[PDB]
Amino acid sequence: GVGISTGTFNNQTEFKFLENGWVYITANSSRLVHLNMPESENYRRVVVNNLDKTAVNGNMALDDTHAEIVTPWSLVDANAWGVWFNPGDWQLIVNTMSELHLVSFEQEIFNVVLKTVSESATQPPTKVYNNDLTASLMVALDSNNTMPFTPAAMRSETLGFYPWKPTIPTPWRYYFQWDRTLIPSHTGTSGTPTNIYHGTDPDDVQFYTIENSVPVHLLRTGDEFATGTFFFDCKPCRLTHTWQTNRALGLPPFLNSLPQSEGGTNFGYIGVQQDKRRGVTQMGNTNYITEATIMRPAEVGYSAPYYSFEASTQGPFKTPIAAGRGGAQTDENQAADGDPRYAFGRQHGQKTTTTGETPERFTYIAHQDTGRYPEGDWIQNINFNLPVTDDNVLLPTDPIGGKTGINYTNIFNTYGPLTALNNVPPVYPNGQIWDKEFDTDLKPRLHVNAPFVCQNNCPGQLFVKVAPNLTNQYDPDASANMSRIVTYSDFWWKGKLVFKAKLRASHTWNPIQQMSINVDNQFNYVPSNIGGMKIVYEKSQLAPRKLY
Amino acid sequence: TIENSVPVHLLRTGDEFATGTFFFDCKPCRLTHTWQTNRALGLPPFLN
Amino acid sequence: VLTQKASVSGSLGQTITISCTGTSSNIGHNNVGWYQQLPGRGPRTVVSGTNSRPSGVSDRFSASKSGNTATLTISGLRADDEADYYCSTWDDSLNVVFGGGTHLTVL
Amino acid sequence: EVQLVESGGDLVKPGGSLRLSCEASGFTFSNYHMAWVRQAPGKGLQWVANIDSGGFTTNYVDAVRGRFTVSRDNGALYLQMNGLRVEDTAVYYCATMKTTYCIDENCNSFQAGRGVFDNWGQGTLVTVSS
């Protein structure tokens, strides 16, 4: 019926404490989604080109050239932390939980409303909105994951984080195949390097369509759609950070002489000369046993080529790295490769009363200390004569290939059988929750964007489209675009995301770091006088844990 | 040496030898190729 | 400066050719563009490489490039073709280099 | 249709300064590299300067190098002229430098390039004398 509501708005986070210290967390999110009709009812194949930018020698890092199928449909993506948890709930979770499991996910659409804009021809323009009770909203649910997976948080296009603000969906578009060549150059590179877009190789063409691969439900003003509960199987996400590096693994050396009076200069002394110490070292030609040369069980962290660009059929891409930098915690402005930087708009955290289109930005300096500090590690000759000379060492200050600004660490990879690393920490509120595992026979060990990875499947993507509202002059034989009555839709989206977490237990004398309100961040969690809201980034691994 | 590690059957003109059925446990082999590289993963940019 | 002929002349309906020349190190690797210049007007791009014409340009124009030389052919002269023709390209010294022009004329 | 309109041409004294403008409409002005090209009375086309699509790099000819400057504001082009001399008297045009060239008729494949100007403005006359 038109006058009977088909659902209830619900945005309450529930905690239900189970046996053995586990907590059943239910995050109900509810939004009002506004949807305009598509620009055109037809699928487009658009080749986006920015050769003007890359035509300038040395700008190869600014390539946006690609090919995309632009579709008339719109994607309703809720794969972002902010959509589910308000700052207080996240504070509770990070301060008192230790591990997080993704349990279930369900979503539904109700109170579908379709309206048409009749723009009067009156000399002073005016427009009246009318309820078209017969219009239909097409809802498609890719339950079988037939369509390409296109997470929205990567582009900051998920639903809004404010329950009391209407949100808009994102027009769905998926990459089409293409070939590209961008020979790197630098300021001073003579001529124009080879920069060509070869087009689409026929063997790799895929042209998906929702109308052909997904059943489509037509919802009038009195209808509702529910996706049913989806159950995850993702690995647990740890809410604790590791501080121990190789230098802090195992039994420390025995201090034969200990300080006698408190002070900043009263250090402990091992006493025994370095060459006469007792231990085990992987270096078989030196008797010097040191805190640096001692044998650790394995390697915590791996050095990777940083700011290295790799070319493939589609052009250049930046090599990802799964660890943060060392010493970047001192200042966010001193961040470097590996620290994820998020840019977001007024829907996703930026002060809602800000003027201008400049996105709000922040670099997330993770609390885990498993990264690398390239200025430190060096290489020296096998003879290990000490002190080393210029001919027997390769310091980070040394050039490679004659380039004064590029040193050896830029092309150094220490990933090996002994490498150990942690999963990506959650980022609030702009961070993604789950991601799909790759279809490759051999699959990546971890993803750099989401902490939870679907082993089998992720929930089907939800697509919404205002059904065509034809005028009486329609003619399919006309090459011109279809004439449509201006129409839009407002519908309420309600989702339930269920987590399971473990409550932390104190295991040390000293307290641990905790998220708290303070005089500096006070006014970042309350509205301004003109209704301005914001959601600042919050750290998710404040509690430490021992690695070995 | 085969004579020391494997039993040996002597087959005359009227004899035959069968190895019996062996059952594999290998992982499946995909008969489809992947075209997407890093530049073609995820949601493309919105073309204004 | 690219080399060009000062002028040419021909009868109406004649298919004619004009040439621009320069060092292959600059006119060779880079593309070449041909523009028309009528009195009381700014240069109008007539040929933009790959024998492709801008929209609104008569199909009579054609162009080709070979090493030091670039050739522009007109398939049948018309009274409105009496005008200056200008070749341009990029130069590996990071410059934009034009020719001296050629005043096409009709007998 | 693409529209480029120049302005600012006027009589000026030698050794002074001036600002020429090139307004653009009907196309994505920010997606195209732009160029200033001058022609003296009855002389051939002479390249004045050029600027990329983001202002990262600008290039000049030796004659105006160190004297003039070019800038853009996503809506129009500007040429700042300093140390004007008598020979500078000429008509200036703003043209889009064709940054892409397709290599087939339907042009499914395209390549980067330089040295071809696609669209031109109207042009403006600058006279420097007493």
From TrEMBL, chain B:
Subcellular location: Virion
Taxonomic superkingdom: Viruses
Residue ranges crossing the lipid bilayer per the database entry: none
UniProt record similarity statement: Belongs to the parvoviridae capsid protein family.
Protein name, entry field: Capsid protein
Residues of the full protein shown: 245 to 292 of 584
